[PDB]
Scaffold this motif. Structure first.
Motif, PDB file in Angstrom:
ATOM      1  N   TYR A 256       0.851  -1.226   0.000  1.00  0.00           N
ATOM      2  CA  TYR A 256       0.000   0.000   0.000  1.00  0.00           C
ATOM      3  C   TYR A 256       0.871   1.255   0.000  1.00  0.00           C
ATOM      4  O   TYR A 256       1.921   1.285   0.647  1.00  0.00           O
ATOM      5  CB  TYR A 256      -0.930   0.011   1.223  1.00  0.00           C
ATOM      6  CG  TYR A 256      -2.103  -0.947   1.128  1.00  0.00           C
ATOM      7  CD1 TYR A 256      -2.235  -2.016   2.022  1.00  0.00           C
ATOM      8  CD2 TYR A 256      -3.074  -0.793   0.135  1.00  0.00           C
ATOM      9  CE1 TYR A 256      -3.299  -2.914   1.922  1.00  0.00           C
ATOM     10  CE2 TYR A 256      -4.144  -1.686   0.023  1.00  0.00           C
ATOM     11  CZ  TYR A 256      -4.247  -2.737   0.921  1.00  0.00           C
ATOM     12  OH  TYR A 256      -5.299  -3.604   0.813  1.00  0.00           O
ATOM     13  N   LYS A 257       0.432   2.289  -0.723  1.00  0.00           N
ATOM     14  CA  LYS A 257       0.902   3.660  -0.478  1.00  0.00           C
ATOM     15  C   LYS A 257      -0.228   4.704  -0.575  1.00  0.00           C
ATOM     16  O   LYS A 257      -0.315   5.443  -1.554  1.00  0.00           O
ATOM     17  CB  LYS A 257       2.064   4.012  -1.418  1.00  0.00           C
ATOM     18  CG  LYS A 257       2.821   5.293  -1.042  1.00  0.00           C
ATOM     19  CD  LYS A 257       3.793   5.079   0.124  1.00  0.00           C
ATOM     20  CE  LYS A 257       4.993   6.037   0.032  1.00  0.00           C
ATOM     21  NZ  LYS A 257       6.071   5.703   1.009  1.00  0.00           N
ATOM     22  N   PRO A 258      -1.071   4.792   0.471  1.00  0.00           N
ATOM     23  CA  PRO A 258      -2.282   5.629   0.509  1.00  0.00           C
ATOM     24  C   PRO A 258      -2.035   7.154   0.561  1.00  0.00           C
ATOM     25  O   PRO A 258      -0.963   7.588   0.973  1.00  0.00           O
ATOM     26  CB  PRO A 258      -2.977   5.160   1.790  1.00  0.00           C
ATOM     27  CG  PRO A 258      -1.878   4.592   2.638  1.00  0.00           C
ATOM     28  CD  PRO A 258      -0.908   3.986   1.694  1.00  0.00           C
ATOM     29  N   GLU A 259      -3.025   7.947   0.133  1.00  0.00           N
ATOM     30  CA  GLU A 259      -2.990   9.414   0.269  1.00  0.00           C
ATOM     31  C   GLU A 259      -3.023   9.761   1.740  1.00  0.00           C
ATOM     32  O   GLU A 259      -2.435  10.753   2.179  1.00  0.00           O
ATOM     33  CB  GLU A 259      -4.228  10.079  -0.360  1.00  0.00           C
ATOM     34  CG  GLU A 259      -4.431   9.883  -1.848  1.00  0.00           C
ATOM     35  CD  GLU A 259      -3.270  10.414  -2.650  1.00  0.00           C
ATOM     36  OE1 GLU A 259      -2.116  10.199  -2.221  1.00  0.00           O
ATOM     37  OE2 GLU A 259      -3.507  11.019  -3.716  1.00  0.00           O
ATOM     38  N   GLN A 260      -3.837   9.006   2.470  1.00  0.00           N
ATOM     39  CA  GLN A 260      -4.220   9.382   3.808  1.00  0.00           C
ATOM     40  C   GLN A 260      -4.070   8.235   4.784  1.00  0.00           C
ATOM     41  O   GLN A 260      -4.179   7.065   4.391  1.00  0.00           O
ATOM     42  CB  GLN A 260      -5.643   9.903   3.813  1.00  0.00           C
ATOM     43  CG  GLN A 260      -5.797  11.188   3.035  1.00  0.00           C
ATOM     44  CD  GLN A 260      -7.105  11.264   2.308  1.00  0.00           C
ATOM     45  OE1 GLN A 260      -7.578  10.273   1.756  1.00  0.00           O
ATOM     46  NE2 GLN A 260      -7.723  12.432   2.337  1.00  0.00           N
ATOM     47  N   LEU A 261      -3.778   8.576   6.043  1.00  0.00           N
ATOM     48  CA  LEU A 261      -3.629   7.582   7.092  1.00  0.00           C
ATOM     49  C   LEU A 261      -4.647   7.729   8.200  1.00  0.00           C
ATOM     50  O   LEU A 261      -5.104   8.818   8.499  1.00  0.00           O
ATOM     51  CB  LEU A 261      -2.234   7.625   7.697  1.00  0.00           C
ATOM     52  CG  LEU A 261      -1.040   7.544   6.754  1.00  0.00           C
ATOM     53  CD1 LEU A 261       0.187   8.130   7.433  1.00  0.00           C
ATOM     54  CD2 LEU A 261      -0.804   6.109   6.278  1.00  0.00           C
ATOM     55  N   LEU A 262      -4.957   6.605   8.835  1.00  0.00           N
ATOM     56  CA  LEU A 262      -5.489   6.587  10.187  1.00  0.00           C
ATOM     57  C   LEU A 262      -4.408   6.164  11.176  1.00  0.00           C
ATOM     58  O   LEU A 262      -3.847   5.086  11.069  1.00  0.00           O
ATOM     59  CB  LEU A 262      -6.675   5.627  10.247  1.00  0.00           C
ATOM     60  CG  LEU A 262      -7.519   5.566  11.516  1.00  0.00           C
ATOM     61  CD1 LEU A 262      -8.053   6.927  11.838  1.00  0.00           C
ATOM     62  CD2 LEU A 262      -8.639   4.528  11.366  1.00  0.00           C
ATOM     63  N   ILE A 263      -4.106   7.045  12.122  1.00  0.00           N
ATOM     64  CA  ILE A 263      -3.084   6.795  13.139  1.00  0.00           C
ATOM     65  C   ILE A 263      -3.720   6.497  14.485  1.00  0.00           C
ATOM     66  O   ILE A 263      -4.643   7.198  14.914  1.00  0.00           O
ATOM     67  CB  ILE A 263      -2.152   8.004  13.304  1.00  0.00           C
ATOM     68  CG1 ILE A 263      -1.338   8.203  12.028  1.00  0.00           C
ATOM     69  CG2 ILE A 263      -1.232   7.815  14.523  1.00  0.00           C
ATOM     70  CD1 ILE A 263      -0.383   9.388  12.087  1.00  0.00           C
ATOM     71  N   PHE A 264      -3.240   5.442  15.138  1.00  0.00           N
ATOM     72  CA  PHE A 264      -3.684   5.126  16.496  1.00  0.00           C
ATOM     73  C   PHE A 264      -2.558   5.423  17.448  1.00  0.00           C
ATOM     74  O   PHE A 264      -1.407   5.072  17.190  1.00  0.00           O
ATOM     75  CB  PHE A 264      -4.077   3.650  16.643  1.00  0.00           C
ATOM     76  CG  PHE A 264      -5.254   3.253  15.827  1.00  0.00           C
ATOM     77  CD1 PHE A 264      -5.095   2.853  14.504  1.00  0.00           C
ATOM     78  CD2 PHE A 264      -6.526   3.281  16.368  1.00  0.00           C
ATOM     79  CE1 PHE A 264      -6.211   2.501  13.725  1.00  0.00           C
ATOM     80  CE2 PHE A 264      -7.628   2.919  15.613  1.00  0.00           C
ATOM     81  CZ  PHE A 264      -7.473   2.542  14.282  1.00  0.00           C
ATOM     82  N   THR A 265      -2.903   5.997  18.587  1.00  0.00           N
ATOM     83  CA  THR A 265      -1.918   6.256  19.623  1.00  0.00           C
ATOM     84  C   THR A 265      -2.626   6.425  20.954  1.00  0.00           C
ATOM     85  O   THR A 265      -3.817   6.264  21.044  1.00  0.00           O
ATOM     86  CB  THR A 265      -1.045   7.491  19.293  1.00  0.00           C
ATOM     87  OG1 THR A 265       0.007   7.594  20.252  1.00  0.00           O
ATOM     88  CG2 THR A 265      -1.856   8.757  19.319  1.00  0.00           C
ATOM     89  N   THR A 266      -1.889   6.780  21.983  1.00  0.00           N
ATOM     90  CA  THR A 266      -2.352   6.568  23.338  1.00  0.00           C
ATOM     91  C   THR A 266      -1.642   7.589  24.201  1.00  0.00           C
ATOM     92  O   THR A 266      -0.511   7.920  23.919  1.00  0.00           O
ATOM     93  CB  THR A 266      -1.973   5.143  23.788  1.00  0.00           C
ATOM     94  OG1 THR A 266      -3.152   4.402  24.130  1.00  0.00           O
ATOM     95  CG2 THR A 266      -0.997   5.182  24.936  1.00  0.00           C
ATOM     96  N   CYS A 267      -2.336   8.179  25.164  1.00  0.00           N
ATOM     97  CA  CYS A 267      -1.700   9.069  26.125  1.00  0.00           C
ATOM     98  C   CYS A 267      -2.001   8.622  27.538  1.00  0.00           C
ATOM     99  O   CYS A 267      -3.041   8.024  27.769  1.00  0.00           O
ATOM    100  CB  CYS A 267      -2.188  10.499  25.926  1.00  0.00           C
ATOM    101  SG  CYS A 267      -1.498  11.322  24.484  1.00  0.00           S
ATOM    102  N   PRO A 268      -1.115   8.949  28.503  1.00  0.00           N
ATOM    103  CA  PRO A 268      -1.278   8.482  29.887  1.00  0.00           C
ATOM    104  C   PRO A 268      -2.479   9.079  30.593  1.00  0.00           C
ATOM    105  O   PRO A 268      -2.976   8.486  31.537  1.00  0.00           O
ATOM    106  CB  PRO A 268       0.007   8.941  30.564  1.00  0.00           C
ATOM    107  CG  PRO A 268       0.995   8.995  29.467  1.00  0.00           C
ATOM    108  CD  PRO A 268       0.215   9.544  28.303  1.00  0.00           C
TER     109      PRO A 268
END
Lengths: 107, 106, 107
Positions: C1-13
């Motif tokens: 894949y090389k998409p235009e757009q991403l969905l990013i997952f992340t986390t904060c304390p």
């Protein structure tokens, strides 16, 4: 197509069940981290009827190459047969995080 | 290009989300819709920073049904241009993937 | 894949941090939109004990093109050396939404 690492989604009936499977999966180092959300609602049909379970969402960060084992563990431990259990591709991320997932893995 | 998709979307409240989920599953367009508890969306609208409370939705479905799922959700959604994004499913427990497949007629 | 757009997952304390990072992301116009969920439970190993922290989950929607700056910003604002931070590809969605994402990143 084909990614080195996978984001798995599932649900358990229950947050105690989710916790048990979660910890199993982390003790065994099959997954680097499992995230258990607060309760969700799942709407589906069975099979002429519209159904409404109150469930617990799980996200599993892992290596693809560990997938068959994780699938087996989780599904064996799950009370349903045919639990929600699906994988989407991890396609980038913070390198040292990605590498921790990889290093933690029993390959 | 995947047989199946995971779709993320957002409704302004639980009531509108639930009645959109029910439609989409009555129509056999999604096998399962997950509605989460509320969620803070942060975004720019007037060149100003906004904060809406929303409920998140996940839709599991066949790629082939996507255009209908799109329209259904978007027409029923109160906003002109709501959040609606597709993500590939590339694996899962076979019988679960199969139950998604079986469940659309097309 | 090389998409235009991403969905990013992340986390904060916690949520205050998530808000602070969200706000930065949005006011830098690096992400059109950021979603902070209600607490989740993260299960993971540290020093080969089994740990569970309560954490605040984030979804970032963005152009793949902004990615390096988002990672840079998020990673450095986060209190941990190695935050959870993964991208999955967006391969579809409501055209005018994806546009909006496309248009909110200055060119």
């Amino acid at each position: 197509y084909k990614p080195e690492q996978l984001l798995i989604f599932t649900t358990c009936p229950d947050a105690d069940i989710a916790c048990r499977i979660a910890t199993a999966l982390v003790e065994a180092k099959l997954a680097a981290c499992v995230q258990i959300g607060q309760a969700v609602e799942s709407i589906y049909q069975w099979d002429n009827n519209i159904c409404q379970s109150h469930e617990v969402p799980m996200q599993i960060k892992c290596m693809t190459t560990d997938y068959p084992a994780i699938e087996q563990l989780v599904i064996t431990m799950h009370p349903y047969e045919v639990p929600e259990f699906i994988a989407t591709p991890i396609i980038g991320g913070f390198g040292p995080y990605l590498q921790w997932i990889k290093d933690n893995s029993p390959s």
